[PDB]
Amino acid sequence: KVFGRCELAAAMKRHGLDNYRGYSLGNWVCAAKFESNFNTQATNRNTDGSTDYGILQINSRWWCNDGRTPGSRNLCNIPCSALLSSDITASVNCAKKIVSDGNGMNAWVAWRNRCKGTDVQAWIRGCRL
Amino acid sequence: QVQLQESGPGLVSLSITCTVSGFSLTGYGVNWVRQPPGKGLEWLGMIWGDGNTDYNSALKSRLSISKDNSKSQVFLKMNSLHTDDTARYYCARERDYRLDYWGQGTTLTV
Amino acid sequence: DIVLTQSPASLSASVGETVTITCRASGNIHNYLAWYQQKQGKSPQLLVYYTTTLADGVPSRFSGSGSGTQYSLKINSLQPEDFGSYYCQHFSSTPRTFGGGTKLEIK
């Protein structure tokens, strides 16, 4: 599923991401844009046996277990497959575990490099929520 | 250790410098705010981490904000100075829609 | 542009008392409202952001609330260090603006 930005913003807010650890909602929508381009089925293999899954591209070496990654930690205690649904619940839940403090969004490279420093609020203005 | 310090002409095309440290200008916005003697705060404008700028609607034609990421400096330029521009000028770091650290400011008299 | 109307202009109160400052915006600012405190001869300092979140180190007696176009800052059992000035500021899109300020002074 490819979310529209407003549609995704409303969902993330309903799931408690608006101002989570002090991160305004736009940061999460912006992160999704650059990580998965809003595609809930987005998948991407990296040089290391790691693969990132879902709207927020959760990593299989540290956060979710996919079974094909050496050195898996599975810190979110969840199957990577569980993160490829139209329902963003599992991905947000894992995202909330990843961001344990006010600097946590650095967990997403795209966010640090393409969202931080930009008007992330622009991704949500005009969205009914 | 996040710090910001204004540097200005003192009296006067105006030119004030905001020297920062403790963070990268590529990751945060820097706002310019002024406060006339014994008055309230007035927003002047800002330069986002990505270089974009926005200005006070009424003062836009007289303001120019720019920066040099490599020297951790942000600049405020204001021309057509008038008595009404006399005030303390502040630069402040914006972190995700709140000005979290402010410089001590620098007083200017036109 | 969005304009903020802050009231009252001043407040005379005594330590222990509870006071409320309001800030209403001519347009919906979607909770993007912050509050700052400013002591005489000092730079403004962040107190609350995104309507209800206290900045690090700010005592819990400070509480912010609001939504849409109306907001307020409340100080329960205000203390000596609370006296000084307060300003609200919105962050809804760019032309940002501040409220007119409130001087909280000792009764």
Side-chain angles (χ1 to χ4, degrees), chain A residues 1-44 46-67 69-127 129, chain B residues 1-10 14 16-103 105-110, chain C residues 1-39 41-102 104-107:
Chain A
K1 168 172 189 174
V2 177
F3 274 91
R5 67 184 182 290
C6 296
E7 187 186 3
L8 178 55
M12 297 183 132
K13 182 176 181 173
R14 269 146 46 209
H15 284 67
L17 284 180
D18 185 20
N19 195 44
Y20 177 73
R21 300 297 180 194
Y23 281 106
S24 72
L25 186 63
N27 286 291
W28 309 91
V29 176
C30 189
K33 172 64 188 180
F34 291 97
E35 289 292 351
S36 70
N37 200 206
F38 299 149
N39 188 333
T40 63
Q41 322 280 194
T43 285
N44 297 307
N46 305 299
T47 302
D48 26 285
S50 292
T51 307
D52 300 328
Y53 309 82
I55 184 83
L56 283 176
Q57 295 286 277
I58 307 298
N59 191 69
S60 68
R61 172 165 293 115
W62 281 86
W63 305 97
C64 56
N65 177 58
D66 70 345
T69 300
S72 176
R73 317 292 209 275
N74 187 45
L75 261 36
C76 285
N77 202 41
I78 68 165
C80 293
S81 64
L83 301 173
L84 295 168
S85 159
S86 294
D87 182 340
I88 72 176
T89 294
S91 286
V92 173
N93 283 166
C94 176
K96 282 178 172 179
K97 282 180 180 178
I98 286 166
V99 184
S100 62
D101 68 26
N103 285 66
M105 287 210 78
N106 277 293
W108 290 277
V109 178
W111 178 82
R112 171 198 295 96
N113 295 165
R114 318 198 64 176
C115 295
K116 192 190 188 191
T118 74
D119 177 20
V120 297
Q121 193 192 87
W123 292 102
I124 62 171
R125 288 194 292 271
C127 303
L129 57 81
Chain B
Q1 196 162 175
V2 166
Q3 279 157 39
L4 310 213
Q5 292 169 292
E6 302 83 355
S7 286
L14 171 77
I16 308 178
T17 297
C18 170
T19 304
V20 315
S21 63
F23 67 101
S24 168
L25 288 169
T26 67
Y28 299 81
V30 171
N31 291 219
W32 283 102
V33 173
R34 64 174 183 192
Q35 171 167 47
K39 259 42 184 170
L41 309 173
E42 178 180 23
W43 193 74
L44 293 176
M46 68 186 291
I47 180 161
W48 296 83
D50 61 14
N52 287 119
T53 57
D54 288 292
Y55 303 93
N56 171 297
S57 298
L59 290 169
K60 184 173 185 180
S61 72
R62 292 206 284 137
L63 298 173
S64 194
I65 290 171
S66 61
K67 66 170 181 176
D68 183 330
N69 287 326
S70 78
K71 304 201 291 184
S72 302
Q73 281 185 146
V74 173
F75 317 94
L76 169 61
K77 297 186 189 60
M78 190 179 228
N79 50 48
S80 299
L81 299 175
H82 319 323
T83 58
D84 287 346
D85 294 318
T86 305
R88 173 168 279 281
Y89 285 68
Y90 296 102
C91 58
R93 192 185 77 163
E94 172 168 342
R95 174 193 173 176
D96 195 30
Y97 310 91
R98 59 260 199 189
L99 302 187
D100 62 349
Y101 290 86
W102 296 60
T106 176
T107 53
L108 181 82
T109 310
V110 185
Chain C
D1 294 345
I2 289 181
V3 168
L4 297 171
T5 306
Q6 187 175 336
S7 59
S10 67
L11 281 158
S12 296
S14 303
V15 174
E17 287 173 49
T18 289
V19 298
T20 298
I21 298 176
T22 69
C23 274
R24 304 198 170 182
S26 59
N28 191 333
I29 57 175
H30 309 276
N31 285 305
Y32 284 100
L33 180 90
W35 293 91
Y36 306 87
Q37 167 192 263
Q38 178 176 41
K39 302 305 186 58
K42 296 294 178 179
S43 303
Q45 299 293 42
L46 183 68
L47 261 190
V48 184
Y49 68 89
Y50 199 62
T51 304
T52 67
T53 312
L54 296 63
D56 294 335
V58 180
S60 66
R61 57 172 180 284
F62 284 95
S63 81
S65 60
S67 70
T69 55
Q70 42 189 130
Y71 304 74
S72 56
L73 173 72
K74 184 173 73 175
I75 313 181
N76 283 178
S77 311
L78 69 95
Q79 299 295 301
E81 59 260 46
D82 296 344
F83 291 96
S85 286
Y86 293 82
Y87 300 87
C88 58
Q89 175 196 4
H90 86 263
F91 285 83
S92 187
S93 199
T94 28
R96 277 72 177 288
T97 73
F98 297 85
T102 297
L104 172 60
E105 52 212 315
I106 310 174
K107 180 154 60 184

